[PDB]
Amino acid sequence: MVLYFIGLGLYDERDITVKGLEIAKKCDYVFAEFYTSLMAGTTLGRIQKLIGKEIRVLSREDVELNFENIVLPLAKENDVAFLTPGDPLVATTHAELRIRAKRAGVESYVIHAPSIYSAVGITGLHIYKFGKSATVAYPEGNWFPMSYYDVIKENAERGLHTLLFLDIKAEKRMYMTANEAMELLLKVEDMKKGGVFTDDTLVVVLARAGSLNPTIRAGYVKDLIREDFGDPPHILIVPGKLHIVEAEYLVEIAGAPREILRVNV
Amino acid sequence: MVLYFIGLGLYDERDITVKGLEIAKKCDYVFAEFYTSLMAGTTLGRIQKLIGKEIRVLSREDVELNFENIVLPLAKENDVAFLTPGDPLVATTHAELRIRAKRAGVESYVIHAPSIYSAVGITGLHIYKFGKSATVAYPEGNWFPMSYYDVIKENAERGLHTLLFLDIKAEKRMYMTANEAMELLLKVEDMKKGGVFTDDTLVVVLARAGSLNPTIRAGYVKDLIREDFGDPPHILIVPGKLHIVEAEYLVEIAGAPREILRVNV
Numbered sequence: 001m002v003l004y005f006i007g008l009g010l011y012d013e014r015d016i017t018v019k020g021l022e023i024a025k026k027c028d029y030v031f032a033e034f035y036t037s038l039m040a041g042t043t044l045g046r047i048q049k050l051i052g053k054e055i056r057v058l059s060r061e062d063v064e065l066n067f068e069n070i071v072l073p074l075a076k077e078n079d080v081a082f083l084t085p086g087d088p089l090v091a092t093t094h095a096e097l098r099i100r101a102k103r104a105g106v107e108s109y110v111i112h113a114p115s116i117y118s119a120v121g122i123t124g125l126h127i128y129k130f131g132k133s134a135t136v137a138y139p140e141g142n143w144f145p146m147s148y149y150d151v152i153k154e155n156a157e158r159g160l161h162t163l164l165f166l167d168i169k170a171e172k173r174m175y176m177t178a179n180e181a182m183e184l185l186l187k188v189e190d191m192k193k194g195g196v197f198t199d200d201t202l203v204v205v206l207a208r209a210g211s212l213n214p215t216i217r218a219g220y221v222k223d224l225i226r227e228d229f230g231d232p233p234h235i236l237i238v239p240g241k242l243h244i245v246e247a248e249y250l251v252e253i254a255g256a257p258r259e260i261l262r263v264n265v
Numbered sequence: 266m267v268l269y270f271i272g273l274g275l276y277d278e279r280d281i282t283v284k285g286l287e288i289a290k291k292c293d294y295v296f297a298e299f300y301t302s303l304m305a306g307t308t309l310g311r312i313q314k315l316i317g318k319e320i321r322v323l324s325r326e327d328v329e330l331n332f333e334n335i336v337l338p339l340a341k342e343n344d345v346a347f348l349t350p351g352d353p354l355v356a357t358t359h360a361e362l363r364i365r366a367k368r369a370g371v372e373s374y375v376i377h378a379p380s381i382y383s384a385v386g387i388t389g390l391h392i393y394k395f396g397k398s399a400t401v402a403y404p405e406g407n408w409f410p411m412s413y414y415d416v417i418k419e420n421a422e423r424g425l426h427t428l429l430f431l432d433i434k435a436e437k438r439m440y441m442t443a444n445e446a447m448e449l450l451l452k453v454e455d456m457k458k459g460g461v462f463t464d465d466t467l468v469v470v471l472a473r474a475g476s477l478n479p480t481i482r483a484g485y486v487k488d489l490i491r492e493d494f495g496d497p498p499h500i501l502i503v504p505g506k507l508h509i510v511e512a513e514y515l516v517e518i519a520g521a522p523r524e525i526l527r528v529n530v
């Protein structure tokens with residue numbers, strides 16, 4: 001008679017917590033969505049095998065418009081789980097789903113999992129130094145979203161790092177690369193001309209966090225703009241003022257130009 | 266020849282990921298540190314039992330001063346694990362440890378786990394709206410730290426939420442409560458008069474994240490300053506202006522007063 005929101009983690013089926021696995025294994029019905037993010041190292045089958053249950057995948061429409069019609073009814077007489085990539089409530093609108101559950105008289109519980117939001121720690125950038133985050137969305141027709149540019153500007157002025165979630169169109173199997181994000185930012189810079197994002201801007205790229213061998217690279221846009229960072233998902237980070245040790249890690253671990261070791265205090 | 270940084274997650278021994286557990290079980294040596302944080306929902310014994318490996322606990326000094334002569338030597342000819350609460354490399358100084366590994370000719374890999382940085386998503390507050398984070402430390406002697414007040418001021422001023430970690434004396438097993446943090450902030454407000462933290466400030470308290478029954482409370486300081494939020498650890502958040510959807514979640518899930526739907530939106 002309950003609903004469990006269970007995160008599956010960053011890259012493969014083993015990124016689920018032990019708590020999440022043991023609970024999922026005992027649920028009567030298991031649903032999931034794979035449109036909010038991409039788990040590049042697993043398949044629905046591998047997940048089903050690990051959990052030992054048939055998994056009904058839902059689309060954004062199924063969830064956003066029919067969650068209370070598809071999932072909640074069953075949670076009133078059974079133990080139901082709703083699986084999602086990463087952490088269920090991070091950079092998704094799934095939190096609001098708990099409100100729907102309450103209104104339907106269904107109790108819900110949240111089982112966390114590793115999230116890209118905290119995985120940024122592997123870049124060596126102090127996580128407390130990150131400021132407001134933003135999403136780089138694909139332009140549509142004549143609509144060209146640019147608010148993420150102002151977020152970088154606001155953070156940079158305060159010496160804070162900017163995390164940039166990248167766009168995803170699961171149904172079209174489109175996953176925005178860090179390269180595409182950099183190209184869009186240069187276009188916005190050309191329009192706004194604020195000196196926020198240029199060829200000399202230092203950026204950090206993290207691809208496939210969660211895998212044992214993620215791609216972690218740091219450098220100037222002019223040099224990374226066309227570099228191959230591997231398969232998606234990717235996130236782009238625009239660091240603010242660096243601490244000496246952040247710079248050292250980027251150089252030693254992310255192959256950044258030794259030049260950044262020298263910081264302008 | 267390999268060092269694995271493995272996160273133990275948020276609250277109990279089941280918060281480690283499947284990947285983290287399986288890798289730990291295959292390691293010849295397993296070290297752990299519990300000074301950055303403590304798994305309040307479990308014990309060293311239970312973690313040891315789950316992993317099926319003797320766990321050698323390391324102090325802050327063992328790690329910060331002697332990581333290269335305590336952990337790395339063994340990593341040269343064996344597979345070694347270094348367990349930490351939360352997600353590895355979140356603690357400010359841990360990233361640098363990977364530099365030490367490289368310098369020692371030891372390959373290192375990171376196995377992620379849930380971190381409070383992403384788990385706070387359970388408060389219903391959008392992750393992208395969080396700004397710079399900080400820690401509330403106890404005053405002592407002629408030292409009354411209050412920079413965390415400025416962090417709140419700069420974040421709120423830009424409509425951003427402030428995540429506040431509370432002081433902890435690991436060895437003495439003493440946790441600062443949300444109540445104490447609030448009292449301290451009111452004192453800082455009294456000395457700075459910035460109109461940043463007062464009795465009418467809306468705050469959110471998250472205690473025992475990771476647990477299946479966490480305490481999520483939201484309301485004005487005047488009402489929560491003396492409320493019992495249960496056993497530690499406690500996390501305090503001073504939200505910025507709320508999105509109506511954030512407000513509704515706090516009211517419906519965190520028991521916030523209806524008043525926030527008009528006053529803090």
Ligand SMILES: Nc1ncnc2c1ncn2[C@@H]1O[C@H](CSCC[C@H](N)C(=O)O)[C@@H](O)[C@H]1O
Nearest residue numbers: 010037086087090115116166208209233234
């Ligand atoms: N393993 C991974 N590596 C790199 N970026 C990732 C990632 N997982 C998610 N992202 C980034 O975040 C976006 C999804 S946003 C949803 C995030 C998810 N709830 C979590 O907790 O991680 C992706 O488009 C990508 O830009």
Ligand code: NA
Nearest residue numbers: 130395396398
């Ligand atoms: Na943050």
